[PDB]
């Protein structure tokens, strides 16, 4: 399960976190995550252990050893832990909670509590890590984007759209852009300053895209720096090109009929190593493998009786 070249994870309300092989459609293994739905799913940079952010706990299951129960559980947090992220050295963990706190946990320490605490007023919707590993971008429901310096402890907040809740924020490998997405359905993209070495990293406004009519759940960059994807409540995930910020591809699960049910939402997406394909997690209890360029449906894995809120995709050598 951890010895396979492609680790593809899927989680949801059915109380299971399931591992797949991406080139087949056949379910590799199923792990029980009871009593909580999974808010976030992320695989560590060293591919040793996979982490799930649920309600009032963070449960870490072993990828290398097949079919265990969780190695590392982190409790003591009240209400949700919505978002998670990892350091490239595998030592530190970062979690956005609904406690209005972005936290830094020590994984190699036995301590049940957290090593560092950054609290804001509003519940924090997202946490993502700048490639230089010196800073943490933290979005919340107030509409504030907090840039948290992990060294100076200095924090700098930025409010492009006031009073509307930002949901997800991510940053590309080359650190040339920063994109954030909100409940409004707009997607904002800023240019980054290369003052990274002296701890400056200024943000310069570039584009604002009326991406979706309805809410926009997540926005995630392709490792190419070429493609910026945004998933939404409109049953659509749109892939944009970083050049013109024009629409390249539009993924649509829409009923093909005006009167059906709102068949459910596209919650998350993760780009493949070569940026040829894109993975999707939907409320229809399906994880789908799409062709980025063509738009065709390459694969479909249903694993679940209930909904799918999460995705984890890892290609590393």
């Amino acid at each position: 399960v951890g010895s396979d070249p492609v680790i593809l994870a899927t989680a949801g309300y059915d109380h299971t976190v399931r591992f797949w092989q991406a080139h087949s459609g056949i379910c590799t293994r199923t792990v029980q995550h009871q009593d909580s739905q999974v808010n976030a799913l992320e695989v560590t940079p060293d591919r040793s252990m996979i982490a799930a952010a649920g309600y009032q706990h963070i449960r870490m299951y072993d990828l290398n050893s097949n079919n265990p129960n969780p190695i590392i559980s982190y409790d003591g947090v009240n209400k949700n832990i919505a978002s998670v992220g990892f350091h490239e050295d595998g030592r530190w963990m970062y979690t956005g909670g609904e406690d209005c706190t972005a936290r830094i946990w020590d994984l190699r320490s036995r301590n049940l509590q957290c090593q560092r605490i950054f609290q804001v007023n509003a519940p924090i919707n997202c946490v993502c890590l700048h490639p230089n590993q010196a800073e943490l971008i933290v979005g919340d429901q107030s509409g504030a984007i907090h840039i948290w310096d992990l060294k100076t402890d200095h924090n700098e907040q930025l409010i492009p759209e006031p009073e509307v809740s930002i949901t997800s924020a991510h940053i590309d490998p080359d650190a040339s852009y920063m994109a954030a997405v909100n409940s409004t359905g707009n997607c904002y993209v800023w240019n980054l300053t290369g003052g990274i070495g002296d701890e400056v990293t200024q943000l310069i406004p570039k584009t604002k895209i009326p991406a979706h009519t309805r809410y926009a759940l997540q926005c995630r960059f392709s490792p190419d720096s070429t493609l910026l994807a945004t998933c939404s409540a409109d049953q659509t995930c749109k892939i944009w090109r970083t050049s013109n910020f024009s629409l390249m591809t539009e993924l649509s699960i829409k009923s093909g009929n005006p009167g059906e049910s709102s068949r459910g939402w596209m919650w998350g997406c993760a780009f493949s190593g070569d940026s040829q394909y894109i993975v999707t997690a939907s409320s229809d209890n399906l994880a789908r493998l799409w062709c980025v360029e063509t738009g065709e449906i390459k694969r479909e894995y249903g694993g679940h009786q209930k909904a799918v809120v999460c995705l984890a995709f890892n290609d590393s050598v």
Binding site: Y13, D35, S36, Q37, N39, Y55, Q56, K79, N80, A82, E98, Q141, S165, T167, S183, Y215, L217, A233, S261, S262, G264, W265, S283, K306, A307, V309
Partner: protein, 1050 residues
């Protein structure tokens, strides 16, 4: 159309088509509902841009302005259309602009066919009338048939202009005769169609009056008079009134009648046309359209001038207004003192009251322009004082004066606090504050003397001062003196806030308080017997001391009444709580305390007075029986407690709590064994009571003979709940039954004060003509506190909670009562634990998959027929909105379906459970509310189709307006009990000084009143703030997070 409307609108729910939308506002029209049509329009616009008329739409909407702008937009793009021309013309003839109409008719005379020509001629006559071309009028007169009423009518117009009398009279009589059979056809249309031709007969009899006026010089004054009265008499919009008056103008020029055109112009301006009223002011003043603006305004007609002045204020430039106002006052005091000969004392007095309105507006405008600082204080003091001089009887003046003194006091206190945030200071502060304090008291009191039935704001001001600064000698002087001058009735109104302060440490206050409450004790004691009996029993000793002092003071006359009061009250507090429940809660509490919190002290503390209650002995049957069964185990557990007191051994304690657990799980099996109680067992003393002279609780008001308790019904029905209330009922001397909810462990003070507030707001809406017009009201119930735990609530007849009737439709049509909830948990088991987005998706799933038609469908079935159905639905809508607004102002949170109930008959709605106030609701820790009040889709759908923008939103506007208007008084009543000594407790429960937080509250309230609630920078008008509010109570994000037992989806 009541019935036709139902099928029409459900047919609309099938689908929303313009063909339905045109068949909508029509049936709206001859069912006469004006606002609902505005709704049809609103939705039709927010969705369908097909139009295909917006013009007929605005026209039947009685909005001509947008109709014209639309009609030009429609005509310029298209060709020349005979119909569109006619419509575009109707807009203008209602507009009251002839100058355009005459041109527009004569500009194309070719395009008028014999159909369009006959219709043309009529309006055209009205056009030529205004300009004073009677020839145009005459030529276009002969086109209009002598058979239709307006023809022989305008014939009379011409005959009277040409001074042809006999002709005119015959024509008037015939003109009646033709329109006669028309009015016969109203028959549903009552204050309605009758208005419609009340216009016609209006004009006719007016013409009789003309042929009188020109015929002889006597009646002039008398005509001006009937005109006056029925100007005041039947009130109309401007647009019909232009015709209404211009008819009258057929003889008399504006300068004889001037008052008429004056308050007419007042109607124009207060209706939102400044330009029209401006033109009227030029016509009446004799002069002065704005050309030379540098010249002060003609004093030729002081009334007209002044009118024109506040008219200018309501426009953009207030400064020129200010200046010309000062020059005018200064001109007028000189026209007054010197030019007066002793012969006219009539000119003097009116010119002087004029001067008063002048000084007042002066002050108010100084306020508006500047704001409060050291400089304006004495200026407005002076203007106001002068106004006080020139008219001694004006309540407006004295009120503004006193309010201003009060506000100065507040300005200097707040400035002092602003100095404290960052020895001579406190002394200068003392002198200054006293200096502005005493005239405040004086002015407030005298202003009250002239009120006679609304004193309320002013009275709560009197008490705010009295309680804050009262122990100062001068202020005490003013207080006792004002007390001497005033009538004693005034303080009935204020009785509850009085008795809250009886324990006041400052002696000089406690004195005048006891004195006043004693004087009020003399006359109508029925008011003070209940609350002072409640306070006669209190833990803090001072209260019940000074209380029994005044009970004493009452006895010397009222002793029988007093003793029956105390007696019945005691018996009530007893029946409210039987000992077994007392021990139920007492032991649950004690055990929770000692075992959970490891607290022995608290356990003993809550345990012991219960044992005292066990000591004084049963005087009654049920208590005797309880004593019989459990008394031994109880006293034994007590002896084990004393054994832990002496020994220090914990096993003696476990041994006591063994007996305790025994009697407890012996009782808990009997808890829902009582669905009823009999008065012979529980309270023989009450069973005895016959023909008391004691008035029924809360039933007392000064203007009617006393209704008193004849008897008390033997059986009391105990309602099953967590609090387990009792149904009490009483029989009076008037013969009618009076029902009272008996509630244990609940504090009725909050809701009491809130009910006082709603009485006030009821008066407020009683003052607004638009609200009076629409029957806007809040259902209110008499609240009678007994102890802090116990109390009496007036039951509301024919009323069922929302949850109840919902449940009814659930089991009747056999859909699962919780079915939504069960599907929520079905797809999402963790649901309360989900992220906002998940929560929402879930909620939408639940809603798309469920019909919210329950409330409205049942209500359809609830009604005996379609008409009453409609009526009810409307009354609903209205009341709903009333408490919607008054509720968001008061900040009522946590209304679950049960938390309100519907009247079935009147249909109107009641809110209860006011224990949740202000922003406390959203500030609570677990499950905070994002909602002002519930707009949830069942309530939503309960109204007429998409009833959002119909009567609902329009009324939201209305109420909001009223509130922003009367706002000062509302702040008075709110700040009255926000800071009240005993009730400040509820502000500290956000944990699971108080000054600061209370001031936060009142600040946010004033924010609500000024429109500072949403964004601090902007000031929101009623409509937009209503828009964002309704947008807030809408958004699924706010509705999904909610407590699941609060039922967001219903």
């Amino acid at each position: 159309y009541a019935k036709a409307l139902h099928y029409k609108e459900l047919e609309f729910q099938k689908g929303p088509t313009p063909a339905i939308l045109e068949s909508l506002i029509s049936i709206n029209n001859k069912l006469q509902q004006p606002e609902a049509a505005a709704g049809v329009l609103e939705y039709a616009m927010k969705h369908f841009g097909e139009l295909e008329i917006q013009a007929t739409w605005y026209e039947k909407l009685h909005e001509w302005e947008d109709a014209l702008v639309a009609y030009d937009k429609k005509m310029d793009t298209n060709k020349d259309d005979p119909e569109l021309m006619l419509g575009r013309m109707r807009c203008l003839e209602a507009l009251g602009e002839w100058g355009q109409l005459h041109q527009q008719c004569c500009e194309k005379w070719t395009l008028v066919n014999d159909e369009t020509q006959a219709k043309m001629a009529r309006m055209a006559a009205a056009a030529a009338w205004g300009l004073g071309q009677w020839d145009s009028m005459e030529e276009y007169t002969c086109m209009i048939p002598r058979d239709t009423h307006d023809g022989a009518f305008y014939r009379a117009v011409l005959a009277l202009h040409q001074d042809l009398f006999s002709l005119a009279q015959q024509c008037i009589d015939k003109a009646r005769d033709l329109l006669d059979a028309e009015l016969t056809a109203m028959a549903g249309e009552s204050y309605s169609r009758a208005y419609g031709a009340m216009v016609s007969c209006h004009m006719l009899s007016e013409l009789e009056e003309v042929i009188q006026y020109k015929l002889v010089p006597e009646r002039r004054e008398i005509i001006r008079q009937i005109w006056w009265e029925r100007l005041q008499g039947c009130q109309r919009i401007v647009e019909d009134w232009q015709k209404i008056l211009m008819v009258r103008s057929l003889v008399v020029s504006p300068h004889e009648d001037m008052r008429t055109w004056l308050k007419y112009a007042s109607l124009c301006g207060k209706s939102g046309r400044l330009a029209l009223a401006h033109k009227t002011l030029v016509l009446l003043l004799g002069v002065d359209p704005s050309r030379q603006l540098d010249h002060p305004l003609p004093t030729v007609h002081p009334q007209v001038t002044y009118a024109y002045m506040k008219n200018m204020w309501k426009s953009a430039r207030k400064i020129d207004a200010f200046q010309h106002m000062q020059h005018f006052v200064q001109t007028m005091q000189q026209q007054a003192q010197h030019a007066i000969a002793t012969e006219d004392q009539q000119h003097k007095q009116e010119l002087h009251k004029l001067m008063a309105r002048c000084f007042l507006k002066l002050g108010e405008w100084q306020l508006n322009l500047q704001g409060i600082n050291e400089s304006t204080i004495p200026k407005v003091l002076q203007y106001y004082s002068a106004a006080t001089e020139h008219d001694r009887s004006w309540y407006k003046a004295w009120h503004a004066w006193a309010v201003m003194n009060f506000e100065a006091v507040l300005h200097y206190k707040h400035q002092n606090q602003a100095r404290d945030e960052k020895k001579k200071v406190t002394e200068d502060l003392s002198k200054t504050l006293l200096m502005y304090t005493v005239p405040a008291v004086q002015g407030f009191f005298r202003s009250i003397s002239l009120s006679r039935g609304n004193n309320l704001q002013d009275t709560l001001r009197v008490l705010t001062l009295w309680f804050d600064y009262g122990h100062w000698p001068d202020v005490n002087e003013a207080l006792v003196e004002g007390v001497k001058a005033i009538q004693i009735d005034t303080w009935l109104q204020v009785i509850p806030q009085l008795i809250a302060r009886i324990d006041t440490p400052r002696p000089l206050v406690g004195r005048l308080i006891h004195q006043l409450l004693t004087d009020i004790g003399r006359y109508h004691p029925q008011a003070l017997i209940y609350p002072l009996t409640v306070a006669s029993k209190s833990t803090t000793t001072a209260r019940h001391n000074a209380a029994n002092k005044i009970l004493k003071n009452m006895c010397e006359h009222s002793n029988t009444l007093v003793q029956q009061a105390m007696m019945v009250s005691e018996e009530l507090i007893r029946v409210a709580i039987l000992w077994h429940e007392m021990w139920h809660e007492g032991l649950e509490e004690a055990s929770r305390l000692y075992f959970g919190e490891r607290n022995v002290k608290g356990m003993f503390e809550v345990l012991e007075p219960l044992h005292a209650m066990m000591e004084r002995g049963p005087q009654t049957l049920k208590e005797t029986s309880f004593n019989q069964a459990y008394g031994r185990d109880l006293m034994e557990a007590q002896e084990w407690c004393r054994k832990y007191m002496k020994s220090g051994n914990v096993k003696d304690l476990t041994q006591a709590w063994d007996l305790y657990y025994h009697v407890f799980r012996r009782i808990s099996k009997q808890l829902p064994q009582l669905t009823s109680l009999e008065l012979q067992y529980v309270s023989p003393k009450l069973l005895m009571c016959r023909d008391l002279e004691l008035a029924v609780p809360g039933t007392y008001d000064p203007n009617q003979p006393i209704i008193r308790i004849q008897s008390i019904a033997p059986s009391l029905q105990v309602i099953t709940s967590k609090q387990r209330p009792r149904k009490l009922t009483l029989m009076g001397s008037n013969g009618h039954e009076f029902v009272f909810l008996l509630k244990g462990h609940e504090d009725l003070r909050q809701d009491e004060r809130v009910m006082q507030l709603f009485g006030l707001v009821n008066t407020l809406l009683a003052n607004d003509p638009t609200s009076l017009r629409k029957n806007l009201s809040i259902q209110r119930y008499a609240v009678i506190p007994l102890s802090t735990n116990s109390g009496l609530i007036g039951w509301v007849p024919h009323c069922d909670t929302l949850h109840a009737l919902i449940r009814d439709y659930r089991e009747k049509k056999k859909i699962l009562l919780n079915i939504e909830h069960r599907i929520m948990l079905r797809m999402a088991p963790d649901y309360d634990h989900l992220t906002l987005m998940q929560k929402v998706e879930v909620f939408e799933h639940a809603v798309n998959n469920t019909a919210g038609d329950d409330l409205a469908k049942l209500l359809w079935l609830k009604s005996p027929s379609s008409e009453v159905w409609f009526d009810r639905r409307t009354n609903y809508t209205r009341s709903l909105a009333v408490m919607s607004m008054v509720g968001y102002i008061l900040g009522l949170g946590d209304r679950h379906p049960s938390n309100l109930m519907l009247d079935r008959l009147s249909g109107k709605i009641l809110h209860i459970d006011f224990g949740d106030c202000f922003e406390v609701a959203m500030t609570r820790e677990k499950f905070p509310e994002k909602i002002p009040f519930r707009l949830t889709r069942m309530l939503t759908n309960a109204m007429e189709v998409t009833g959002l923008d119909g009567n609902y939103r329009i009324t939201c506007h209305t109420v909001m307006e009223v509130l922003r208007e009367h706002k000062d008084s509302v702040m008075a009543v709110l700040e009255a009990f926000v800071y009240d000594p005993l009730l400040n407790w509820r502000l500290m429960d956000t944990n699971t000084a108080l000054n600061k937080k209370a001031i936060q509250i009142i600040n946010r309230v004033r924010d609500k009143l000024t429109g500072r609630d949403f964004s601090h920078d902007d000031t929101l008008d009623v409509p937009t703030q209503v828009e964002l509010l309704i947008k807030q109570a809408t958004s699924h994000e706010n509705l999904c997070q909610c407590y699941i037992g609060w039922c967001p989806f219903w």
